[PDB]
Amino acid sequence: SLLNVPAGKDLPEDIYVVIEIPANADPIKYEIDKESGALFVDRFMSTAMFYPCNYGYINHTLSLDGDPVDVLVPTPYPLQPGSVTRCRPVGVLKMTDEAGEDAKLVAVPHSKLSKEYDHIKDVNDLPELLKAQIAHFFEHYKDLEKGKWVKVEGWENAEAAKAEIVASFERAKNK
Amino acid sequence: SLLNVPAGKDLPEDIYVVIEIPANADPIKYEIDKESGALFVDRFMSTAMFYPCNYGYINHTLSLDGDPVDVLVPTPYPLQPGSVTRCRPVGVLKMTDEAGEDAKLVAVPHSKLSKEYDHIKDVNDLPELLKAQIAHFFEHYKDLEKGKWVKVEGWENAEAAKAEIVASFERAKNK
Amino acid sequence: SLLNVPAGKDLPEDIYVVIEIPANADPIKYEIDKESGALFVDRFMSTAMFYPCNYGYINHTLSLDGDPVDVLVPTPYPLQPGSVTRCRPVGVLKMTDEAGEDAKLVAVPHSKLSKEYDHIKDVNDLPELLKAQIAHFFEHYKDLEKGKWVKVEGWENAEAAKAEIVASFERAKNK
Amino acid sequence: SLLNVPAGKDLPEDIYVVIEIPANADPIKYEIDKESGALFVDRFMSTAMFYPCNYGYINHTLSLDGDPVDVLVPTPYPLQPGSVTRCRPVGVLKMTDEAGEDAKLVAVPHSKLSKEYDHIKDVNDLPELLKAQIAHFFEHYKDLEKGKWVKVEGWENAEAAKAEIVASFERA
Amino acid sequence: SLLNVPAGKDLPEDIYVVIEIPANADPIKYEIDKESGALFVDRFMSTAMFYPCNYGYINHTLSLDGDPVDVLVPTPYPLQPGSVTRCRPVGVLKMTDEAGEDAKLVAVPHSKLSKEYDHIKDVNDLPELLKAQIAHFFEHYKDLEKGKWVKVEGWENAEAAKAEIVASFERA
Amino acid sequence: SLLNVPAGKDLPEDIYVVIEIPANADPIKYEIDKESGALFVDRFMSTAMFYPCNYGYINHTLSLDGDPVDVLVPTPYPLQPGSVTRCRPVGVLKMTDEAGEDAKLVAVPHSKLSKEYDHIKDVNDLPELLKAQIAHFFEHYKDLEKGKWVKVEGWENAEAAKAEIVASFERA
Ligand SMILES: [Zn+2]
Ligand SMILES: [Zn+2]
Ligand SMILES: [Zn+2]
Ligand SMILES: [Zn+2]
Ligand SMILES: [Zn+2]
Ligand SMILES: [Zn+2]
């Protein structure tokens, strides 16, 4: 059912993000199980931190880590885990962990859901506070997980985010 | 999965309502996507208003607008989006918008879920405050959406609500 | 989708519990519908009580009452109804109601989700307060439901809980 | 501040209830400290129960047990601990406990706050569910506290509640 | 305690707003009782609406209607009723109602609490959505109270808001 | 009201902590204003972190920095800002920051509120997770405030916490 959600109506400008974790929520790290399509509790986060945006993935995408492309979606109110939001990518936070590079895309609600993010075209239009919060969160959220750590390279633009979407959409397509 | 929820055990007295939006919640207007069966964020409501009851639809029904029949369900506590409640229709709020007539049925929890609505047989048994809140909500909730408005005709009885259920159940059945 | 959730990765030490009702929540008694797989509102609980743990079931199990095996899962934060948690059984509360014996297993989050329950190997490792709360809840929660009551026998160990899991997993398997 | 809240505008028909505990809330039993006037955590409730209504007291009253008159107030949404609600008494639940007799008044929001309770004149106009819940709650909430118990004796009417208010206003 | 909160550190550019109602909260209209200083439930709102911002007053001010100056304060998370927020006025919404003229100031968190509102100097720097919501909220929230209404006249600037603060500080 | 809360019933073993911030709550840093006694919004926290325990102070204490003694209190459910909890000190976390040395006491609910913390006699009886979270929280929560930092030095025992309470009680 979540397994049948499209990657988007018009990828990569117009995508759907399947939400796993709300912004500002308790430290329960939910993940959609690939086989069942169900919402699984993956971990109880150990640090006293919360995701600054809603966090989820684009369906029918395959990152180089073997999981779908991760996305953060700011909204005026937290979303329900398992809900799906139509959005437009505007940027991407690049980083490295105990297993190679990682990226966290950022996408904003689509103009048909709200007009309040229309002026966010690219990564520099986003509030600097929000960006600095996101960066800080990912550097530190796994600090108390044994054998796990993260370090942040920096922020890239919407074109780079779209390229990640496309490469991973094409990579999942090709077996 | 929600796609496989019946219209009811004994339509139109005994129906199931698939809940999309809780009573008294943040202004996130969720809708179940017809193809996928998933819970999609349709809009971030622009007015500072909330639904006075839980709001959802009856599955396997086709209104003249092309969507399933909408229903409001009062409960003592807000319900989870994506949950399904067995109820009994008691009434219907008629109205017109930028696209023709619309109706919002009202149904109360079934006696097997709670005895507290048993005395609500027809539309005049409902609290007048609740009715006036519902009417006011629908007149005003789209006031700040461009090219959108609503105006309310009035309240009709349980027989009329059941007729809407039946006509739309039969209309979906017939291709 | 919840219908396709396994009983576990390695039953009966390593099981999945499909959550229906969060700990410390409003008195809405949700149940997963067996046919549809959807989350149904079964009852509005009449007593002013809440479940001391999250409450759910193990999929692909058949108790002697005809329903899957019920499980309580303590967590540091309440879980979302419809989510799935990997856990390890440590005990079981035995009791009788208006229809024969019943058991409520207790299982703790699996070590891959959290290290905080690792020291809970068997039923006596659980906080005595929590146990006494669970026992009291089940004795009294149906006190105001007509023709319904419950009485508690006592607590049995992890081996007994695992035997219930196995017997009901094998019972569902065999038509 | 809470120390200076009136017992009421026109006692006993028109009173103020200082709220200590919301309806449907976590099992934290707050109580206003008499000396300071501050909101104290009195207990973490041991049973997995919640108060069916908001719970508090009428200021400037003293019951036989030396504490102010206790009151339950139903509202359409839970109230903030430390807030003060204008209400109209309608009933009283009589009980005994480990310390002896006890009484809990029930009062509904005053007509100037809401019309929704205008029809509740007396104890029997309250919903049967809510009454049954309250009785059950008080019967069982101390079940897991050693040496503490409650036996509910019964309900009494709005005249009975008003009489308690007056008598306890005078006692203070 | 709330009775002893200053009007501000450096009125009218630097003020304190006592909060009565959170943004996005249940429809319970609290109001600080002038005599006691306690948080009273004034009304259960009849329309299914919520305040777009936190709402409260500046202490030691008196408006022509005999009540203190009312203020809306946007914050990134809702504030607790009875809490006090240091802010900077930026605007005012002018309206009339069943009692006559009314004005609601808007003030943003002071730079020492957050940098997020530094760029809001004047009424037109506020988001157009939020302004439209506030106006709509005040236009309609009393629609289901008999004999009560509001017509919004318009917005005025930060100088206008400051002038109201000063004048009302003096009136008290 | 909060100004008149005792330091404790039997300091330093039996104290009262005035709560400013709940465990697991939105990133709003409230602080009781010393002059008024009212709950002020001191800051909107910039990092996406939450306090692992409820946080507050002991009234009628003064630390070397001129502010009252700070205390963390774990509870099974979060407490209301402005509420007062009877607890028993067990430990203290020592740190330094942009202003110099700092210390945060840890105290657990008193046995009359709950038996759940009776077994916690001293710093090492606290759960290792909670201790690690607290340390991490204080290490990082000011990471996005310019010119503000914390380096955690270490934990000290229940005797050390009691000594701080006494010394700071005397300083006031
Ligand atoms: Zn939260
Ligand atoms: Zn709400
Ligand atoms: Zn709850
Ligand atoms: Zn609650
Ligand atoms: Zn809300
Ligand atoms: Zn929280």
Side-chain angles (χ1 to χ4, degrees), chain A residues 1-33 35-145 147 149-174, chain B residues 1-33 35-145 147 149-174, chain C residues 1-33 35-145 147 149-174, chain D residues 1-145 147-172, chain E residues 1-145 147-172, chain F residues 1-145 147-172:
Chain A
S1 178
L2 290 172
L3 302 183
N4 304 142
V5 174
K9 295 193 82 192
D10 183 13
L11 190 148
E13 266 77 19
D14 188 354
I15 64 164
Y16 290 125
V17 173
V18 179
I19 303 295
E20 300 174 309
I21 307 179
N24 301 85
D26 295 343
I28 300 161
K29 155 56 170 193
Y30 297 104
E31 199 186 65
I32 300 301
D33 178 52
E35 283 304 310
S36 67
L39 189 67
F40 274 38
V41 180
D42 193 49
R43 208 196 331 289
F44 294 99
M45 185 175 296
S46 284
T47 51
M49 308 194 79
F50 61 84
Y51 284 77
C53 300
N54 309 288
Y55 181 71
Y57 64 96
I58 307 167
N59 200 31
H60 304 317
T61 65
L62 186 62
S63 311
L64 296 166
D65 76 298
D67 290 334
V69 173
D70 300 334
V71 190
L72 299 135
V73 186
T75 56
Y77 301 100
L79 300 182
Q80 174 154 301
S83 62
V84 184
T85 180
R86 197 186 172 176
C87 44
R88 177 168 56 70
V90 295
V92 55
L93 181 56
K94 284 279 204 150
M95 52 193 217
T96 100
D97 61 67
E98 72 273 16
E101 279 180 28
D102 206 331
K104 309 311 211 206
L105 289 64
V106 66
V108 297
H110 193 266
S111 192
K112 293 279 175 158
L113 279 60
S114 160
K115 314 304 175 179
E116 304 310 288
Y117 303 87
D118 286 335
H119 78 289
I120 312 302
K121 338 277 181 173
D122 208 339
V123 67
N124 291 354
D125 302 336
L126 287 159
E128 303 292 303
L129 172 59
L130 180 60
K131 289 184 295 202
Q133 291 178 331
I134 292 166
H136 179 258
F137 172 85
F138 284 105
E139 285 176 39
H140 296 286
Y141 80 126
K142 295 195 292 181
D143 284 348
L144 301 185
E145 301 301 332
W149 50 263
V150 184
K151 289 176 183 54
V152 162
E153 304 296 343
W155 285 100
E156 321 197 344
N157 70 12
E159 289 316 303
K162 291 168 177 185
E164 180 52 11
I165 290 159
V166 171
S168 295
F169 181 74
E170 300 296 344
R171 187 177 307 108
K173 174 193 272 177
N174 298 309
Chain B
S1 178
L2 290 172
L3 302 183
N4 304 142
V5 174
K9 295 193 82 192
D10 183 13
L11 190 148
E13 266 77 19
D14 188 354
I15 64 164
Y16 290 125
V17 173
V18 179
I19 303 295
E20 300 174 309
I21 307 179
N24 301 85
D26 295 343
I28 300 161
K29 155 56 170 193
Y30 297 104
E31 199 186 65
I32 300 301
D33 178 52
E35 283 304 310
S36 67
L39 189 67
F40 274 38
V41 180
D42 193 49
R43 208 196 331 289
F44 294 99
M45 185 175 296
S46 284
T47 51
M49 308 194 79
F50 61 84
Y51 284 77
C53 300
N54 309 288
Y55 181 71
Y57 64 96
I58 307 167
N59 200 31
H60 304 317
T61 65
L62 186 62
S63 311
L64 296 166
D65 76 298
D67 290 334
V69 173
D70 300 334
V71 190
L72 299 135
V73 186
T75 56
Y77 301 100
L79 300 182
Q80 174 154 301
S83 62
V84 184
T85 180
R86 197 186 172 176
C87 44
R88 177 168 56 70
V90 295
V92 55
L93 181 56
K94 284 279 204 150
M95 52 193 217
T96 100
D97 61 67
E98 72 273 16
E101 279 180 28
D102 206 331
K104 309 311 211 206
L105 289 64
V106 66
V108 297
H110 193 266
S111 192
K112 293 279 175 158
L113 279 60
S114 160
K115 314 304 175 179
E116 304 310 288
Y117 303 87
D118 286 335
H119 78 289
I120 312 302
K121 338 277 181 173
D122 208 339
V123 67
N124 291 354
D125 302 336
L126 287 159
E128 303 292 303
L129 172 59
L130 180 60
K131 289 184 295 202
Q133 291 178 331
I134 292 166
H136 179 258
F137 172 85
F138 284 105
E139 285 176 39
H140 296 286
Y141 80 126
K142 295 195 292 181
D143 284 348
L144 301 185
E145 301 301 332
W149 50 263
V150 184
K151 289 176 183 54
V152 162
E153 304 296 343
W155 285 100
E156 321 197 344
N157 70 12
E159 289 316 303
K162 291 168 177 185
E164 180 52 11
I165 290 159
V166 171
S168 295
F169 181 74
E170 300 296 344
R171 187 177 307 108
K173 174 193 272 177
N174 298 309
Chain C
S1 178
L2 290 172
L3 302 183
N4 304 142
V5 174
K9 295 193 82 192
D10 183 13
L11 190 148
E13 266 77 19
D14 188 354
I15 64 164
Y16 290 125
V17 173
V18 179
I19 303 295
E20 300 174 309
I21 307 179
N24 301 85
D26 295 343
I28 300 161
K29 155 56 170 193
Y30 297 104
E31 199 186 65
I32 300 301
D33 178 52
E35 283 304 310
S36 67
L39 189 67
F40 274 38
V41 180
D42 193 49
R43 208 196 331 289
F44 294 99
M45 185 175 296
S46 284
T47 51
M49 308 194 79
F50 61 84
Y51 284 77
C53 300
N54 309 288
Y55 181 71
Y57 64 96
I58 307 167
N59 200 31
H60 304 317
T61 65
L62 186 62
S63 311
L64 296 166
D65 76 298
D67 290 334
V69 173
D70 300 334
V71 190
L72 299 135
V73 186
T75 56
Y77 301 100
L79 300 182
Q80 174 154 301
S83 62
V84 184
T85 180
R86 197 186 172 176
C87 44
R88 177 168 56 70
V90 295
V92 55
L93 181 56
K94 284 279 204 150
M95 52 193 217
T96 100
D97 61 67
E98 72 273 16
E101 279 180 28
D102 206 331
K104 309 311 211 206
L105 289 64
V106 66
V108 297
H110 193 266
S111 192
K112 293 279 175 158
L113 279 60
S114 160
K115 314 304 175 179
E116 304 310 288
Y117 303 87
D118 286 335
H119 78 289
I120 312 302
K121 338 277 181 173
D122 208 339
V123 67
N124 291 354
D125 302 336
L126 287 159
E128 303 292 303
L129 172 59
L130 180 60
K131 289 184 295 202
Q133 291 178 331
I134 292 166
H136 179 258
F137 172 85
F138 284 105
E139 285 176 39
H140 296 286
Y141 80 126
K142 295 195 292 181
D143 284 348
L144 301 185
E145 301 301 332
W149 50 263
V150 184
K151 289 176 183 54
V152 162
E153 304 296 343
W155 285 100
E156 321 197 344
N157 70 12
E159 289 316 303
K162 291 168 177 185
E164 180 52 11
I165 290 159
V166 171
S168 295
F169 181 74
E170 300 296 344
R171 187 177 307 108
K173 174 193 272 177
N174 298 309
Chain D
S1 192
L2 282 174
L3 300 176
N4 311 123
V5 171
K9 273 174 157 278
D10 188 14
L11 187 160
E13 284 78 23
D14 182 0
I15 62 168
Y16 291 125
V17 172
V18 178
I19 305 298
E20 300 172 309
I21 301 167
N24 300 95
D26 297 342
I28 297 159
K29 158 61 160 186
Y30 296 98
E31 189 190 73
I32 298 304
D33 179 53
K34 287 193 189 141
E35 292 273 340
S36 63
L39 189 68
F40 276 33
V41 178
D42 195 54
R43 198 167 325 292
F44 295 97
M45 224 191 312
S46 278
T47 49
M49 307 192 72
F50 63 82
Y51 283 74
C53 299
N54 310 282
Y55 181 79
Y57 65 97
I58 300 167
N59 197 25
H60 306 306
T61 58
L62 189 89
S63 298
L64 296 199
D65 73 343
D67 294 329
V69 169
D70 296 323
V71 191
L72 298 149
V73 183
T75 55
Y77 306 92
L79 305 184
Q80 179 160 305
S83 61
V84 181
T85 181
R86 194 182 184 183
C87 45
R88 188 168 45 73
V90 291
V92 35
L93 182 65
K94 294 287 207 162
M95 67 203 70
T96 58
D97 61 35
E98 73 280 353
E101 192 164 306
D102 189 22
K104 308 299 189 202
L105 276 64
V106 190
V108 300
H110 192 263
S111 194
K112 304 259 190 162
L113 277 55
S114 169
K115 300 287 181 290
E116 180 178 342
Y117 304 84
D118 278 353
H119 73 282
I120 312 294
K121 317 304 190 78
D122 211 356
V123 63
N124 293 326
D125 308 329
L126 290 164
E128 292 293 306
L129 176 62
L130 185 66
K131 293 197 284 171
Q133 291 174 328
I134 294 168
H136 187 269
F137 173 88
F138 281 105
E139 188 69 49
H140 292 290
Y141 80 123
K142 303 196 291 182
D143 282 354
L144 302 193
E145 321 294 353
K148 294 192 164 64
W149 51 272
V150 177
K151 181 182 155 183
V152 170
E153 310 295 337
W155 291 92
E156 312 191 322
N157 79 348
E159 277 290 300
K162 287 173 201 183
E164 182 53 30
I165 291 165
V166 171
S168 295
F169 190 67
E170 295 293 327
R171 253 186 295 277
Chain E
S1 192
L2 282 174
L3 300 176
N4 311 123
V5 171
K9 273 174 157 278
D10 188 14
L11 187 160
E13 284 78 23
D14 182 0
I15 62 168
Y16 291 125
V17 172
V18 178
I19 305 298
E20 300 172 309
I21 301 167
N24 300 95
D26 297 342
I28 297 159
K29 158 61 160 186
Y30 296 98
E31 189 190 73
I32 298 304
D33 179 53
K34 287 193 189 141
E35 292 273 340
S36 63
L39 189 68
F40 276 33
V41 178
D42 195 54
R43 198 167 325 292
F44 295 97
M45 224 191 312
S46 278
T47 49
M49 307 192 72
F50 63 82
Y51 283 74
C53 299
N54 310 282
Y55 181 79
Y57 65 97
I58 300 167
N59 197 25
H60 306 306
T61 58
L62 189 89
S63 298
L64 296 199
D65 73 343
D67 294 329
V69 169
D70 296 323
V71 191
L72 298 149
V73 183
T75 55
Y77 306 92
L79 305 184
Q80 179 160 305
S83 61
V84 181
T85 181
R86 194 182 184 183
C87 45
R88 188 168 45 73
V90 291
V92 35
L93 182 65
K94 294 287 207 162
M95 67 203 70
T96 58
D97 61 35
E98 73 280 353
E101 192 164 306
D102 189 22
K104 308 299 189 202
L105 276 64
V106 190
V108 300
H110 192 263
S111 194
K112 304 259 190 162
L113 277 55
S114 169
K115 300 287 181 290
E116 180 178 342
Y117 304 84
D118 278 353
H119 73 282
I120 312 294
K121 317 304 190 78
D122 211 356
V123 63
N124 293 326
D125 308 329
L126 290 164
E128 292 293 306
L129 176 62
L130 185 66
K131 293 197 284 171
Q133 291 174 328
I134 294 168
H136 187 269
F137 173 88
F138 281 105
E139 188 69 49
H140 292 290
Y141 80 123
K142 303 196 291 182
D143 282 354
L144 302 193
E145 321 294 353
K148 294 192 164 64
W149 51 272
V150 177
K151 181 182 155 183
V152 170
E153 310 295 337
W155 291 92
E156 312 191 322
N157 79 348
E159 277 290 300
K162 287 173 201 183
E164 182 53 30
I165 291 165
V166 171
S168 295
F169 190 67
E170 295 293 327
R171 253 186 295 277
Chain F
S1 192
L2 282 174
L3 300 176
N4 311 123
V5 171
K9 273 174 157 278
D10 188 14
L11 187 160
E13 284 78 23
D14 182 0
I15 62 168
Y16 291 125
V17 172
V18 178
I19 305 298
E20 300 172 309
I21 301 167
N24 300 95
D26 297 342
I28 297 159
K29 158 61 160 186
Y30 296 98
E31 189 190 73
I32 298 304
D33 179 53
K34 287 193 189 141
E35 292 273 340
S36 63
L39 189 68
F40 276 33
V41 178
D42 195 54
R43 198 167 325 292
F44 295 97
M45 224 191 312
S46 278
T47 49
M49 307 192 72
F50 63 82
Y51 283 74
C53 299
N54 310 282
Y55 181 79
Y57 65 97
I58 300 167
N59 197 25
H60 306 306
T61 58
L62 189 89
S63 298
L64 296 199
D65 73 343
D67 294 329
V69 169
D70 296 323
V71 191
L72 298 149
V73 183
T75 55
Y77 306 92
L79 305 184
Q80 179 160 305
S83 61
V84 181
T85 181
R86 194 182 184 183
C87 45
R88 188 168 45 73
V90 291
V92 35
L93 182 65
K94 294 287 207 162
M95 67 203 70
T96 58
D97 61 35
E98 73 280 353
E101 192 164 306
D102 189 22
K104 308 299 189 202
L105 276 64
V106 190
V108 300
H110 192 263
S111 194
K112 304 259 190 162
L113 277 55
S114 169
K115 300 287 181 290
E116 180 178 342
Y117 304 84
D118 278 353
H119 73 282
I120 312 294
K121 317 304 190 78
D122 211 356
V123 63
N124 293 326
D125 308 329
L126 290 164
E128 292 293 306
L129 176 62
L130 185 66
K131 293 197 284 171
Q133 291 174 328
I134 294 168
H136 187 269
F137 173 88
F138 281 105
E139 188 69 49
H140 292 290
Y141 80 123
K142 303 196 291 182
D143 282 354
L144 302 193
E145 321 294 353
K148 294 192 164 64
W149 51 272
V150 177
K151 181 182 155 183
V152 170
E153 310 295 337
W155 291 92
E156 312 191 322
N157 79 348
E159 277 290 300
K162 287 173 201 183
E164 182 53 30
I165 291 165
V166 171
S168 295
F169 190 67
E170 295 293 327
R171 253 186 295 277

